[PDB]
Every structure is written in structure tokens, then in C-alpha cells.
């Protein structure tokens, strides 16, 4: 399906999942959210835009916050992803996040992922990634990064809510900000603001991508 790309970096894959080991040779994987999974990832200009001012309150403010990052640019690196998450799933559990990126440039990149409540940072995961040459480009992979305990707790609490509409009510004030940076130059390669609802679709998890624009 649709993914996100700036001039310097393309995110081809993103997934968060729960993997259960039934026995040493049998694994069951449930995807909560996914980009570039059920169909090959792509990027094209047929994107619609969202006024970034409409979402500033849902993300960290001040120096290094969303407004500061957007103002510093480049504007073509900024996206809003809405996920309709698939929460229908059941020691031997592993909660993971995987992602993959491509660039024409050989860089050392840093990926900062901030989980936010009412626009306030609760936890941050920071990962450093080196390039691998592949089919005429450089690839970067975060493979099966353990989901932090806050998110495991959050998902447990969500599933313990008696009604699905309650889950949506909680999700309205839960956001994730992903900022991928060239470590040396500090250039913003990708900045993705994530917003969530629960999926009601028979096909499971879904996503919509929007460009973020000034007005």
C-alpha cells in the first residue's frame, strides 16, 4: 500500500506485531498496524494535505517539538499517518516493531520514536541504523525491535476495556511521533505523526497517509 518518502529517504515497511510461539517450530504473528505488507510499498504525488496547525496540540511543543521541526524543514519530509489498528488477537509472547527504509545516500541515521499522551512525551525509543548496499541503493532496517513496556501495558489496558468505542476515546489522545534524522547533519529525513483508531474493517488493519502542510 501507500508509504512515505522525502527527497532523501523512503520508508518502505512499517509494522507492529505480536508473535506467539505455539511450539519451537510454530509461530503465529498478528499485525496491529502495517505499511508495505499486504501489498508492495509505493510513493506517488497523489497525496492529500492536512493543515499541521490542526495537530500541533497532539504532539510535543517547544524546541525540537513538531512545530520547530516543521519550521526547520524540509516540508516534504512531513507526514500524518492515520492507523486503524487491528486489536483482535490473543512466556511465549513477543511484541515487536519492524521497519525498512531506502535512500540513494549512504548515511548513518537515527530514528527517534516518541509516544505521547495529550501531546506530552511519555517515552522515547532511539535507534541508530547503518546502511547496506542493495540493488542500486542503500537500505536501512530496524528488525524486530522489542516494543517498549509502556506500549505493551497500553495495549493490554486497551483490550481490557469492555467496549470498542472506549478504546477509540482513549486512542484520541494517544499519538506517536517518529523522527528519522541524518545523525551527522541532523537533517530531518522523515517526520511521521501517527494517529490511531480501532479498525472495524473485515480486512483488518488499515492506514491513510497525508502530507503535512503549513496552512
Amino acid at each position: 500500500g501507500r508509504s512515505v518518502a522525502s527527497s532523501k529517504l523512503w520508508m518502505l515497511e512499517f509494522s507492529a506485531f505480536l508473535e506467539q510461539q505455539q511450539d519451537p517450530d510454530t509461530y503465529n504473528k498478528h499485525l496491529f498496524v502495517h505499511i508495505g505488507q499486504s501489498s508492495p510499498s509505493y510513493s506517488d504525488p497523489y497525496l492529500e494535505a492536512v493543515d499541521i496547525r490542526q495537530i500541533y496540540d497532539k504532539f510535543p511543543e517547544k524546541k525540537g517539538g513538531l512545530k520547530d521541526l516543521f519550521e526547520r524543514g524540509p516540508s516534504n519530509a512531513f507526514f500524518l499517518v492515520k492507523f486503524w489498528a487491528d486489536l483482535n488477537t490473543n512466556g511465549s509472547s513477543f511484541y515487536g516493531v519492524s521497519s525498512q527504509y531506502e535512500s540513494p545516500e549512504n548515511m548513518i541515521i537515527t530514528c527517534s520514536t516518541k509516544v505521547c499522551s495529550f501531546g506530552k512525551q511519555v517515552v522515547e525509543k532511539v535507534e541508530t541504523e547503518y546502511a547496506r548496499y542493495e540493488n542500486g541503493h542503500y537500505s536501512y532496517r530496524i528488525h524486530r525491535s522489542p516494543l517498549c513496556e509502556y506500549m505493551i501495558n497500553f495495549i493490554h489496558k486497551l483490550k481490557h476495556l469492555p467496549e470498542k468505542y472506549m478504546m477509540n476515546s482513549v486512542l484520541e489522545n494517544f499519538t506517536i511521533l517518529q523522527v528519522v534524522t541524518n545523525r551527522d547533519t541532523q537533517e530531518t529525513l522523515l517526520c511521521i505523526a501517527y494517529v490511531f483508531e480501532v479498525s472495524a474493517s473485515e480486512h483488518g488493519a488499515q492506514h491513510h497517509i497525508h502530507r503535512l502542510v503549513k496552512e
Binding site: 492529500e48 492536512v50 490542526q54 499522551s117 495529550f118 506530552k120 482513549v170 489522545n173 472495524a200 488499515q206
Partner: protein, 40 residues
Amino acid sequence: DSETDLEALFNAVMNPKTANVPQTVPMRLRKLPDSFFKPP
């Protein structure tokens, strides 16, 4: 109080009479595209 309190977050929806979280404008009331609320 603390805005990042995970228990308070969920208590607000489970037991609305005791909700102690920031009040906000629901996404559905904001100037956002129609697609934003219609899954594909």
C-alpha cells in the same frame, strides 16, 4: 496530577464520573479531510 498517568488515561473512559484528564477538541470536530474518518 500528571497528564502522562496511564491509569488516569483509562480511568477517564472507564469511570467518566472520576475523569481527571485534560479536556480536548475531538478529532471529528476539527478542520480535517473527510477521508480522515473513513477507512479504505
